[PDB]
RNA sequence: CCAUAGGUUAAUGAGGCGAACCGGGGGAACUGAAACAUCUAAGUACCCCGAGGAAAAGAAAUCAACCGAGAUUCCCCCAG
RNA sequence: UUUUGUAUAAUGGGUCAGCGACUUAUAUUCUGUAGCAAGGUUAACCGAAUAGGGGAGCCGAAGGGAAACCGAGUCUUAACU
RNA sequence: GUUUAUUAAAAACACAGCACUGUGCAAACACGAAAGUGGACGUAUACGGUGUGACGCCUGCCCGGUGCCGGGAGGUUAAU
RNA sequence: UGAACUCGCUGUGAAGAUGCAGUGUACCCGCGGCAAGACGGAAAGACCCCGUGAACCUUUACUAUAGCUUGACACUGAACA
RNA sequence: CUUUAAUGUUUGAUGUUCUAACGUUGACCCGUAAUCCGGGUUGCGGACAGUGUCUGGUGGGUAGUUUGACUGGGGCGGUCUCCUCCUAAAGAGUAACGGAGGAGCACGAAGGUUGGCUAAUCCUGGUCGGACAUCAGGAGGUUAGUGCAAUGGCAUAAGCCAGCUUGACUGCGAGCGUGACGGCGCGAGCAGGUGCGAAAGCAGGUCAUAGUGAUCCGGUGGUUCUGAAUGGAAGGGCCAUC
């Protein structure tokens, strides 16, 4: 049978041109008023997955 | 505990707001700071309001 | 026991040493109080972190009335 | 249901008319694709009249430099 | 009271067995979830009923997208 | 064999002969290799001979953005040296 | 008298007697999707449950807690 | 029942030695006896701990649920207060 | 509007009665050699009881399960995140059920910024006024103070008063530090728009390091996004926040 993609992983990562994956930063859902705006600003844009935890992502979604 | 959290809402402009903490028991009156609205791109009187 | 607690270690100290070339923005010293002070082309942030404000070589000096350690940069 | 038509694979249809249904019969884009776009992928020679397709600003320069019209 | 229930013989048929496949009526749990209860295993194993050489479906109150197709079943993609 | 460590008085075996444990299918990625190369390749299917058809499709040659969308750029933002 | 067939025969179980308690007979209760059986072809001096355990002398106080029984105003309260 | 040409001692040693070191002692081989040792044989310790193991049992643990119980609607109609 | 009288007109919980559904494990008759069952006359009940679907309660009667780890064996006790000091061997880091303490906030001024100030403890002298209130002087030199523990810091003061104020600002961010990662921190400069100061400038919270929790799932407001035929809409997304 075909490999099933880990769907939850498909909904949190997106494949970039070179091969890596963009993902949204954690700590930006609730409890925002106590956070400084400089954090919240820096957490807003999408960010790349580190080389340590890349193999875990590549495994759980083999298609794209 | 004790010190609750409030929503400073803009007067002149869109419903953009700031959020801060406030002690309600010691300071029963309302805030009226003059903060920057970025939708209008202007400093405006921000009044206190509830969530 | 009664005790057995401790905080995580803060990695404070002189990061870039005297004579070392640094780029503008490079943190030179992470520390609590001003054990070292900001001299020429060096900033001093809210954490009392001394950082390079210009590209150059780090220079430690011992200058002033009270004989304090200053960190300067010279291009 | 949108496509990204590479300019190199454009003069492969019917002389110089690329509506969409003609472009589909050339097997360049899929069957269930109603919107399409011609991007600057490079290399045109023949004059191609591109009618209906949304065309890119870089490709509009090339297609017209080769001789082809648009719309 | 009228008829009905019932009782008699005759005509025709049914009954039981059998490998899988088939359609229905019921229908688990171990297991996986690194525990577990939603969920999974799975309408699976099993039980029952009724067929036939096949059985089910099936000639749109079906899709589609302003273009069009035209019952059903089966195979390959669509597509993990 | 298992262990920091076993002549160990820790495990297992009386001996012999035979059998006895990294497989298979499908997807996916990487390496070698071969073909052809901005292309490569066909599936079910027909055909009867592993040929030949069949390019439906798939992957690649374009990315950025949540998306509309724009596109060698694009997102960010009122705009970005 | 009974009991751990096969390491325990006992002070354990049962026992007559005792009390509480349910049950008005299509009884309570029990087995059973149900039909239906038993209780009982009995009917409160009967039947089931529970504790206690011949007999003798006795069986004191507490109803805050938990249960049970009764009460029905008020508060709270589902489907509809 | 790994294979043995299967002694004592004091040491040493996976920390209690027939097997190692140093020693001492001992011709080869049965038969009857005794049971101190071969951590003798017998049952993959029952104690103990572990395993996100099992089972049963308990309860004012969680979640359900048969039973019992309350209403509403259905089977379910008719007058009078 | 209040307050209430007579008549019409709105339903529904009552409380008797009534008989034809329904019940009969009452009597008799028949099918019939039959305590079964059915049917028929009846008598008693009687729209109750009972059953189906909803529903609230009750429910170890039964079922499925859970019931942490560390641990100088396990249990009992204690502990689990965060900050400070030592242990820590003069970079960083560094364990133990090692040694000592803290935190789970506070604050619209206790932030910003311009202008000023300078502290403890004494010794004297002085109305009550004492061992200690306030005043005056001296001697002291930070022995204090810093919203909260400790360490490092603070006189240019970051300590203490004062005047104006909202930089506790939105978009960014060269570059660094620290993380296995999720993350966490520092940051000149830039764009916009502000306070303060005559300006030089300063200001993206507070002397610094504690004051805290991921995702998912929903809630709230916004939005040049999507909008399963088409217009909308719901639901999404994106922003802000709970
Ligand atoms: K280490
Ligand atoms: Mg790519
Ligand atoms: Mg960062
Ligand atoms: Mg694909
Ligand atoms: Mg203004
Ligand atoms: Mg410790
Ligand atoms: Mg520390
Ligand atoms: Mg530590
Ligand atoms: Mg930790
Ligand atoms: Mg700063
Ligand atoms: Mg095609
Ligand atoms: Mg362009
Ligand atoms: Mg016959
Ligand atoms: Mg015949
Ligand atoms: Mg038949
Ligand atoms: Mg038959
Ligand atoms: Mg079948
Ligand atoms: Mg079948
Ligand atoms: Mg079947
Ligand atoms: Mg079924
Ligand atoms: Mg299960
Ligand atoms: Mg299970
Ligand atoms: Mg499991
Ligand atoms: Mg498991
Ligand atoms: Mg378990
Ligand atoms: Mg079935
Ligand atoms: Mg069967
Ligand atoms: Mg059958
Ligand atoms: Mg045939
Ligand atoms: Mg036939
Ligand atoms: Mg048929
Ligand atoms: Mg049919
Ligand atoms: Mg039909
Ligand atoms: Mg018809
Ligand atoms: Mg027709
Ligand atoms: Mg038709
Ligand atoms: Mg037509
Ligand atoms: Mg046609
Ligand atoms: Mg078709
Ligand atoms: Mg072993
Ligand atoms: Mg080993
Ligand atoms: Mg072992
Ligand atoms: Mg060991
Ligand atoms: Mg040995
Ligand atoms: Mg050895
Ligand atoms: Mg051995
Ligand atoms: Mg030994
Ligand atoms: Mg031995
Ligand atoms: Mg052993
Ligand atoms: Mg072992
Ligand atoms: Mg072994
Ligand atoms: Mg052995
Ligand atoms: Mg393998
Ligand atoms: Mg492939
Ligand atoms: Mg490759
Ligand atoms: Mg080539
Ligand atoms: Mg070809
Ligand atoms: Mg064939
Ligand atoms: Mg064809
Ligand atoms: Mg062809
Ligand atoms: Mg073709
Ligand atoms: Mg590729
Ligand atoms: Mg652009
Ligand atoms: Mg622009
Ligand atoms: Mg007996
Ligand atoms: Mg007997
Ligand atoms: Mg006996
Ligand atoms: Mg016995
Ligand atoms: Mg027996
Ligand atoms: Mg036995
Ligand atoms: Mg016995
Ligand atoms: Mg005995
Ligand atoms: Mg006896
Ligand atoms: Mg006895
Ligand atoms: Mg007894
Ligand atoms: Mg009595
Ligand atoms: Mg009595
Ligand atoms: Mg029952
Ligand atoms: Mg009954
Ligand atoms: Mg009887
Ligand atoms: Mg007793
Ligand atoms: Mg007496
Ligand atoms: Mg008593
Ligand atoms: Mg009472
Ligand atoms: Mg009383
Ligand atoms: Mg009670
Ligand atoms: Mg009661
Ligand atoms: Mg009561
Ligand atoms: Mg009442
Ligand atoms: Mg009441
Ligand atoms: Mg009420
Ligand atoms: Mg109410
Ligand atoms: Mg020895
Ligand atoms: Mg020796
Ligand atoms: Mg020797
Ligand atoms: Mg000797
Ligand atoms: Mg002998
Ligand atoms: Mg003997
Ligand atoms: Mg022995
Ligand atoms: Mg033994
Ligand atoms: Mg064992
Ligand atoms: Mg035990
Ligand atoms: Mg045990
Ligand atoms: Mg566990
Ligand atoms: Mg475990
Ligand atoms: Mg429950
Ligand atoms: Mg009613
Ligand atoms: Mg009705
Ligand atoms: Mg009647
Ligand atoms: Mg009557
Ligand atoms: Mg009868
Ligand atoms: Mg009869
Ligand atoms: Mg008779
Ligand atoms: Mg009888
Ligand atoms: Mg009868
Ligand atoms: Mg009858
Ligand atoms: Mg009847
Ligand atoms: Mg009758
Ligand atoms: Mg009556
Ligand atoms: Mg009822
Ligand atoms: Mg219920
Ligand atoms: Mg309860
Ligand atoms: Mg249980
Ligand atoms: Mg079970
Ligand atoms: Mg268990
Ligand atoms: Mg368990
Ligand atoms: Mg337990
Ligand atoms: Mg535990
Ligand atoms: Mg443990
Ligand atoms: Mg331990
Ligand atoms: Mg343990
Ligand atoms: Mg212990
Ligand atoms: Mg404990
Ligand atoms: Mg140290
Ligand atoms: Mg150190
Ligand atoms: Mg060192
Ligand atoms: Mg360590
Ligand atoms: Mg503590
Ligand atoms: Mg707070
Ligand atoms: Mg002020
Ligand atoms: Mg300040
Ligand atoms: Mg002096
Ligand atoms: Mg001090
Ligand atoms: Mg202190
Ligand atoms: Mg200040
Ligand atoms: Mg100050
Ligand atoms: Mg002013
Ligand atoms: Mg103001
Ligand atoms: Mg003012
Ligand atoms: Mg803040
Ligand atoms: Mg911070
Ligand atoms: Mg501008
Ligand atoms: Mg500006
Ligand atoms: Mg101004
Ligand atoms: Mg000014
Ligand atoms: Mg200026
Ligand atoms: Mg400042
Ligand atoms: Mg402050
Ligand atoms: Mg502080
Ligand atoms: Mg802090
Ligand atoms: Mg969760
Ligand atoms: Mg959501
Ligand atoms: Mg809503
Ligand atoms: Mg809108
Ligand atoms: Mg936009
Ligand atoms: Mg729309
Ligand atoms: Mg739209
Ligand atoms: Mg709209
Ligand atoms: Mg559709
Ligand atoms: Mg239309
Ligand atoms: Mg629509
Ligand atoms: Mg319109
Ligand atoms: Mg929405
Ligand atoms: Mg939403
Ligand atoms: Mg955007």
Block residue for tokens 């640094």:
C22
Sheet holding C69-74, edge to edge: C21-22, C56-62, C69-74, C36-38
- Tell me the chain B residues in contact with residue A32 when contact means C-beta distances shorter than 8 Å: 19
Distance CA D59, CA C34 (A): 61
Q: Which two tokens stand for residue C2?
A: 């009664």
Instruction: Say if the Cβ atoms of B21 and A33 lie within 8 Å.
Output: yes
Other Cβ atoms less than 10 A from the Cβ of C36: the count is: 20
Return positions of chain I under 7 A from a protein CB: 78-88, 91-95, 97-102, 105-109, 151-154, 156, 158, 165-188, 192-195, 204-209, 211-223, 238-242
Neighboring chains of A (3 or more beta-carbon pairs < 8 A): B
Q: Is D30 exposed, middle or buried (0-12, 13-18, 19+ CB in 10 A)?
A: exposed
| Residues of chain B contacting residue A33, judged by C-beta atoms under 8 Å apart | 5, 19-21
The token pair at A64 is: 């794209």
Q: Report the distance separating Cα B18 and Cα B5, nearest Å.
A: 11
Cβ contacts of B17 within 8 Å, gap of 6 or more: B7, B8, B9, B10, B46, B49
Please count the residues of chain A: 64
Question: What's the CA gap between C23 and C26, in Å, rounded?
Answer: 6
Contacts of A19 (CB under 8 A, 6+ apart): none
Q: State the Cα torsion A47-A52-A57-A60 to the nearest 10°.
A: -160
H or E element in which residue A38 lies = helix A37-43
CATH number, span D1-70: 3.100.10.10
Domain boundaries, chain B: 1-51
Give the DSSP per-residue string, D6-63.
Answer: ETTSSSSSSSSB--SHHHHHTTSS-SS--B-EEE------S--BB-SSEE-HHHHHHH
Which positions 7-46 on chain D have a beta carbon less than 7 angstroms from any atom of strand E? 32, 34
Placement of tokens 């580190």 in the chain: A50
**Tokens read off for C31:** 């520390």
DSSP state, B16? Answer: -
Name the 3-class secondary structure at B24.
Answer: coil
Contact D36, D23 (CB under 8 A): yes
Can you tell me the distance from the alpha carbon of A12 to that of A47, in angstroms, rounded to the nearest whole number? 11
Say which DSSP state B11 is in: S
The experimental method is cryo-EM
Q: Which burial class, exposed, middle or buried, applies to D5 when counting CB atoms under 10 A from its CB (0-12, 13-18, 19+)?
A: buried
Picking from A22, A27, A23, the residue whose alpha carbon sits closest to that of residue A43 is A27
Helix (H) / strand (E) containing A55: helix A54-60
- Residue-wise DSSP of chain C: ------PPP---EESSPTT-EE-TT-EEEE-SS-SEEE-TTB---TT--EEBSSSEEEEEEE-SSS--EEEEEE-
For A25, which DSSP code?
Answer: P
- Evaluate whether D24 touches D62 at the Cβ level (below 8 Å): no
* Cβ < 5 A residues, ion ligand 5: B 43
Q: Pull the structure tokens for residue C26.
A: 């490079």
Rg (CA), chain B: 12
Kindly state the DSSP code that residue A31 receives in the 8-state scheme.
Answer: -
């Amino acid at each position: 049978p075909k490999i099933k993609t880990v769907r939850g992983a498909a909904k949190r990562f997106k494949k970039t041109g070179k091969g890596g994956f963009k993902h949204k930063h954690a700590n930006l859902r609730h409890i925002l008023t106590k956070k400084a705006t400089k954090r919240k600003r820096h957490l807003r844009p999408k960010a790349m997955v580190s080389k340590g935890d890349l193999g875990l992502v590549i495994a759980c979604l083999p298609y794209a | 505990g004790i010190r609750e959290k409030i929503k400073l809402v803009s007067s002149a402009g869109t419903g953009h707001f700031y959020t801060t903490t406030k002690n309600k028991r010691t300071k029963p009156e309302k805030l009226e700071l003059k903060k920057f609205d970025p939708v209008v791109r202007q400093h405006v009187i921000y009044k206190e309001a509830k969530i | 026991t009664r005790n057995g607690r401790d905080s995580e270690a803060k990695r404070l100290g002189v990061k870039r040493f005297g004579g070392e070339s640094v780029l503008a923005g490079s943190i030179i010293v992470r520390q609590r109080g001003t054990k070292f002070h900001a001299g020429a082309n060096v900033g001093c942030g809210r954490d009392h972190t001394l950082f390079a404000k210009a590209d150059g070589k780090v220079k430690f000096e011992v200058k002033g009335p009270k004989n304090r350690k200053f960190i300067s940069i010279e291009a | 249901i949108t496509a990204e038509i590479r300019l190199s694979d454009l003069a492969k249809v019917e002389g110089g008319v690329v509506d969409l249904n003609t472009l589909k019969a050339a097997n360049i884009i899929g069957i269930q694709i109603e919107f399409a776009k011609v991007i600057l992928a490079g290399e045109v020679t023949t004059p191609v009249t591109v009618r209906g397709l949304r065309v890119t600003k870089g490709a509009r320069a090339a297609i017209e430099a080769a001789g082809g019209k648009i719309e």
